[PDB]
Structures are given as C-alpha cells and as structure tokens.
C-alpha cells in the first residue's frame, strides 16, 4: 500500500490517505463549509441536496446529489468513486455501508468543551488538504477565537439570562446549556436560565406559562419548520402569545430569531461558526 501523506482523526477509526482526497462525499454540512472556506470546494463531489441551508446553496451546482440529510443514495455514492466519505451523526446508521465504498470519517463534538473539540475536528479535516489546508485553518480559526472572546467578554459583563427554544409546528421545546445549542452557552458565554432542561436532542416541551415563569431576558428561537421548508402557519401567534410578549426578552427587543436552516441543519464549520457569531450580535 502507498505511504500515508495525510491522516484524519474523528469519532471513527483514524483514516490514513496516500494523497489529498479529491473526490469527497459529505453528509456533514459544516464540514462542507469548512472545505469550501479552505479553498477546496472543487474536491466535494457529492452532498445531499434535498435540504440545503441558503448559505451553502452555491455548492448544489458543483456536486452530485447523494440523497437527504438522513437517507443516503448508496448507488449514487459508489458511482462517484469517492476517496473520502464524511458521515454525520444523523447518518451514523449507514457508516458500515459507507466504509464498503471508501474511507469514512464522522466528526463529533463534546457538549461540554464544544469549541475545543470543534476546533480539533476542523483542524483534522483541514489537514486532509495538506499544509495549505492546515495553514488556512489556523488563520481562520484565529479570527474566530478573537470574535468569540469579544462576545464572551460582553456577556460576562451582563447578568441577563437566555432561554433557547426550538419551535416546531406550534410546539415549543427548551434546550439547556449542554445541548445541540452549546455554542451559545459553553463558548459564547450567554448565561442559561435557572431552569434545567432534560438534555434530549428534541428538548423539553414548555408551555406559555413555563416561559412566563422562567422570565428570560433573552429568548433565542430556532424555527425548525422554516429550517426544513415546512408550512410555518402552525407557528402563527406562538411568540405573540401574551405570556411570551410580556417577558423582559420580548419587551426589550431580545427575541432573537436565529437563521433557521443555518442553526438547525449546520454548524461546526469555519463558515457556519462565523455566520452564527454574526447572527447573535443583535442579542448583545
Ligand atoms: Cl400555558
């Protein structure tokens, strides 16, 4: 076998390649956005195109469609002759099938040390593109580290408490400091409310009375329905309910409608992290 030139650590077995991969299939959209930010978008040959966040739309034309965020088209993947497949938590059930086709990685973040683990994943992926990738990632990560510190410093000067909810077909689910939205709390140092929420990936259902009682100063909202292109009519009037409209968050202009597709479908990449930080400036 040819000698190893690049190595990629992840939650899976370390992948060792004899050259930079030029035919990549990815189900991880953050990884796609990292690859593009590093200057290697041409190397991505397959991505699911059923539900693509707007910020990534221009990659649709340069890839072949390999299915949906949860359901791969294995025939389409094999036909692309990939030299690397980037799986995702959502597609972990297909990792054995992916491995039959090509070396496969799957990046996982800690819910505790979200940013250190995410940076390690970004650096590992970037190294697949040699010194050029590694150098560019160092440069871009330095800017993100500085932006993160600036946000964290502002939050550390405040005592406001922030509640984070997912809105889905008129149902509200609250999420805690260690959750799919850890970046807000662990990394950016928004402060959670005193109410702890069953750490489920779908959150804990909350009523209008619950939100009133929590009494948040900032309310982050991720609208799942909009993120996936559903009928948003079921969410009409939810945030406008008097019990939410009378929170200090609402009255003070701190209901923050986070870009739905970015936050629900992506994250963990160089560009997605940058855009996420931009999105929360109005919450400071
Ligand atoms: Cl209620």
What features would you describe in this structure?
This protein is an alpha/beta fold and 284 residues long. The chain has two domains: 180 residues, Nitrogenase molybdenum iron protein domain (Rossmann fold, 3-Layer(aba) Sandwich), CATH 3.40.50.1980; 104 residues, Rossmann fold. 37% of the residues lie in helices and 16% in strands. The protein contains twelve helices and 13 strands. Strands 8, 9, 10, 11, 12 and 13 form a six-stranded mixed sheet that branches. Strands 5-4-3-6-7 form a five-stranded parallel sheet. A two-stranded antiparallel ribbon has the order 1-2. Helix 1 links the parallel strand 3 and strand 4. The radius of gyration is 20 Å and the shape is globular. Chloride ion binds next to helix 7.
Keywords:
binds chloride ion; 16% strand; 284 residues; five-stranded parallel β-sheet; Rossmann fold; alpha/beta; globular; monomer
Broad structural category: alpha/beta
**Termini, distance in Å?**
54 Å
Oligomeric form of this entry? monomer
Overall shape:
globular
Q: What's the helical proportion of residues?
A: 25-40%
CATH superfamily of the largest domain: Nitrogenase molybdenum iron protein domain
Please give the CATH architecture of the largest domain: 3-Layer(aba) Sandwich
Q: What Rg, in angstroms, do the CA atoms define?
A: 20 Å
Ligands bound, unique: chloride ion
PDB class: transport protein
Keywords: center for structural genomics of infectious diseases, csgid, alpha and beta protein, iron transport
Assembly: monomeric
Entry title: Crystal structure of iron uptake ABC transporter substrate-binding protein PiuA from Streptococcus pneumoniae Canada MDR_19A
């Amino acid at each position: 076998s040819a000698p190893t030139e690049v190595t990629i650590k992840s939650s899976l077995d370390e992948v060792k390649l004899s050259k930079v991969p030029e035919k990549i299939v990815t189900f991880d959209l953050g990884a796609a956005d990292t690859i593009r930010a590093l200057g290697f978008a041409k190397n991505i040959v397959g991505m699911p195109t059923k539900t693509v966040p707007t910020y990534l739309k221009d990659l649709v034309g340069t890839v072949k469609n390999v299915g949906s965020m949860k359901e791969p088209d294995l025939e389409a993947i094999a036909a692309l002759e990939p030299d690397l497949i980037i799986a995702s938590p959502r597609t972990q059930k297909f990792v054995d099938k992916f491995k039959e086709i090509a070396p496969t990685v799957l990046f996982q973040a800690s819910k505790d040390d979200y940013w250190t683990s995410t940076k390690a994943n970004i650096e590992s992926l970037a190294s697949a593109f040699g010194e050029t990738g590694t150098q560019k990632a160092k440069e871009e990560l330095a800017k993100l580290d500085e932006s993160i510190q600036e946000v964290a410093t502002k939050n550390e000067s405040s005592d406001k408490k922030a509640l984070a909810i997912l809105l889905n077909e008129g149902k509200m689910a609250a999420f805690g400091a260690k959750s799919r939205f850890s970046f807000l709390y662990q990394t950016l140092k928004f402060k959670p409310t005193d109410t702890k929420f069953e750490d489920s990936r779908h959150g804990q259902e909350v009523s209008f009375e619950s939100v009133k009682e929590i009494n948040p100063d900032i309310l982050f909202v991720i609208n799942r329905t909009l993120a996936i292109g559903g009928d948003n009519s079921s969410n009409d009037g939810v945030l406008e309910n008097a019990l939410i409209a009378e929170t200090p968050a609402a009255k003070n202009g701190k209901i923050i409608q986070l870009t739905p597709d970015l936050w629900y479908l992506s994250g963990g990449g160089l560009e997605s992290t940058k855009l996420m930080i931009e999105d929360i400036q109005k919450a400071l």
